[PDB]
Design a protein around this ligand. Structure first.
Ligand SMILES: [Cl-]
Ligand SMILES: [Cl-]
Ligand SMILES: [Fe+3]
Ligand SMILES: [Fe+3]
Lengths: 308, 307
């Protein structure tokens, strides 16, 4: 029974002067992690720690807005199925903060203008922005960080493509089309402390989680030993996991693991997960050459219906 | 057969506003790592990445001096048994660089003046500094870095003291005496590439290794499955391990593991290990109350003779 998910240092891939052996070491480590656990810690991404800390400060800043202003940009008010804006807690009584055991989030994605023909299509459309926060303090750092998440998931996909079974003869670009005009939702999550008194998989391709220091929140189901693996916070790391669409694309070689967040917090906790769903119109062919075709957006919408 | 040594984030101990649960989590993780493997990765130390990169640049800078300049401060020339200065390769033919499969090092420790009564005693005395390297590029950043390593091993020892068996009833200060006027050698290591064509334990209390990015060098012997565990470089981390004197002090609860560096390098590789040996005159009592008394310096010298 494993005690931890593995860790992958991708430095050899962020620098063009690393040895072929070191790059190959990264490829094998990430391939084994994603085909065994579906999860791994990633370090060596090169995203400055000040930027990560700024993202968590944005989460805290948004959460500090009064309930009325956050509901002014409720996801109810977004365009079509773009699912952008404020996700309210399940219960609320006051304008300030959260009731214990609830959570709230700000969701934003790829900026698509309202008059674009795709606006309002699944996970596609304009973002909603809280007007009381100045651009320099919220929207601008979040969009800059979004640039960096897009570049990081591109690198992750190149490493993963190099890690597939060689007899499938997949080229290292095999995933690249998913990164063109993609669905890329990001959440700024605020978890209230636990009171004194869930199980899921991600549907997309790659998830990149920024954790705040604190007690263990995340657990990953490992079927072979039927155990929940805790994922404590590791300084400098992201938690990376594969989603259902990636598992489907790779005919099950890369696993999409069940996971849940446990709330042992005595104070409010924040996190910032970024999700690569991918281009919602891309038709993906099973990389084992079995001829199965899956359209990303149809797959994700189907997963939503099956889970709700 | 384990595949990795554990990772311990000590952030909860570098901040006084972290929860008691988080601090206890750090204590438990570090204790289990040191009593099982004797080794762990440490992150969250707060030492800036620019400072770590500078230390490795100092290693490269020193190594780039010609043989004649480096031998000007050979360890042969240090005062008494202070063991400070330049450790030359086992073989050499040119003034520049190293022959494959060899290594060289710069060694410096706690600055003790030449007229101090302890100067020249075991691992104690003044440092040798290469006269061709400007202070701002070498001696000054290394001495500041040395302060940061001393503070980090102080934190590690506090965590380790909290991880001992509760039935021994050890107080959390139990190791602190080792950090007063200690032997603290640090090396700037330069490994030549492998040619086309060792196994040991550390003698002191706590070792703190800064690795350079590259292929796996370090391996740790794990007896229960009789396997060499690779220790690849992890960004932002130090590799921490217990030495023989910590194993002795804790009556074997904390393990001093055998380890070795393997050379798969096609180009020169650098590292910066810092060693807490401790105060050489401190008499340590086995923390299980078995009455055994060990003087750190005598232990380290005896371990040197045994090897
Ligand atoms: Cl790695
Ligand atoms: Cl930890
Ligand atoms: Fe998830
Ligand atoms: Fe060693």
């Amino acid at each position: 029974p494993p005690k931890t998910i593995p860790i992958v240092d991708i430095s050899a891939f962020i620098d063009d002067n690393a040895s072929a052996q070191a790059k190959d070491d990264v490829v094998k480590a990430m391939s084994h992690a994603c085909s065994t656990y579906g999860f791994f810690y990633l370090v060596g991404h090169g995203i400055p720690e000040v930027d990560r800390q700024q993202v968590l400060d944005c989460a805290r800043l948004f959460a500090s807005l009064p309930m009325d202003e956050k509901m002014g940009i409720s996801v109810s008010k977004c365009m079509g199925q773009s699912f952008r804006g404020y996700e309210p807690p399940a219960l609320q009584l006051h304008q300030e903060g959260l009731l214990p055991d609830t959570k709230e989030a700000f969701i934003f994605g790829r900026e698509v203008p309202a008059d674009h023909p795709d606006a309002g299509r699944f996970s596609t459309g304009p973002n909603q922005w809280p007007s009381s926060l100045p651009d320099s303090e919220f929207r601008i750092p979040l969009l800059k960080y979004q640039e960096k998440m897009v570049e990081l998931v591109k690198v992750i996909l190149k490493i993963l493509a190099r890690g597939l079974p060689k007899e499938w003869n997949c080229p290292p670009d095999v995933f690249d089309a998913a990164t063109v005009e993609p669905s890329i939702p990001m959440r700024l999550l605020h978890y209230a402390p636990q009171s004194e008194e869930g199980d899921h998989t991600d549907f997309g391709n790659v998830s990149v989680l920024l954790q705040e220091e604190g007690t263990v929140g995340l657990e990953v189901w490992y079927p072979p030993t039927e155990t929940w693996i805790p994922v404590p916070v590791i300084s400098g790391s992201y938690v990376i996991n594969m989603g259902d669409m990636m598992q489907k694309w790779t005919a099950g070689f890369y696993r999409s693991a069940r996971h849940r967040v446990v709330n042992h917090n005595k104070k409010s906790r924040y996190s910032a997960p970024f999700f690569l769903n991918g281009n919602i119109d891309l038709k993906c062919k099973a990389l084992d050459g079995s001829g199965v075709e899956t359209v990303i957006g149809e797959h994700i919408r189907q997963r939503l219906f099956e889970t709700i």
